[PDB]
């Protein structure tokens with residue numbers, strides 16, 4: 001269980 | 010007349026969690042920002058903050074002071090503010106205190122966008138605990154302050170614009186001024 005929200009710089 | 014903003018400009022940072030981004034305040038080795046940052050777009054309407062906090066790890070926070078990324082080494086939630094422990098103390102930390110103001114009192118606001126200071130002006134808290142500020146999109150996390158000799162009194166962290174165009178936010182301990190909640194309604 002890991003957060004997979006894509007990071008946008 | 011607003012207070013000179015130089016002492017506060019050096020404390021402003023950008024905080025990003027996934028695609029959500031806003032302004033944070035970097036004092037000593039702690040970054041203070043609205044907890045709304047841990048919401049994705051879907052969560053913003055009705056966030057369950059306790060549950061979102063569980064899902065995030067330190068490495069899901071991207072903190073940038075200008076071009077320099079700061080390493081987040083801990084995080085906690087205090088009322089409506091998130092506190093991010095970073096591995097670097099801010100060398101421009103002024104002498105400061107946190108204070109809660111009353112209606113009728115004035116303060117200076119440093120409006121910021123994406124971590125970068127944009128303007129300074131003076132506001133007054135109205136009797137219903139809203140302020141008629143000058144804030145655009147991206148200004149969440151901008152702070153209000155007064156200068157008391159060598160000491161910066163932080164009194165306001167901006168959260169949201171209300172439907173009538175006035176603004177609402179918290180003190181630096183995360184407690185709202187007025188009967189508001191940090192949700193997109």
Ligand SMILES: Cn1cnc(Cn2c(=O)nc(Nc3cc4cn(C)nc4cc3Cl)n(Cc3cc(F)c(F)cc3F)c2=O)n1
Nearest residue numbers: 028029030045144145146147148149168169170191192193
């Ligand atoms: C017009 N105006 C005047 N003051 C404000 C302040 N403010 C803001 O800057 N941003 C907000 N929502 C976000 C959207 C995002 C989109 N991305 C990619 N990242 C975002 C980050 C934020 Cl914070 N909001 C709305 C808002 C922010 C809150 F912190 C809150 F608790 C409820 C809310 F409805 C906003 O008012 N905009």
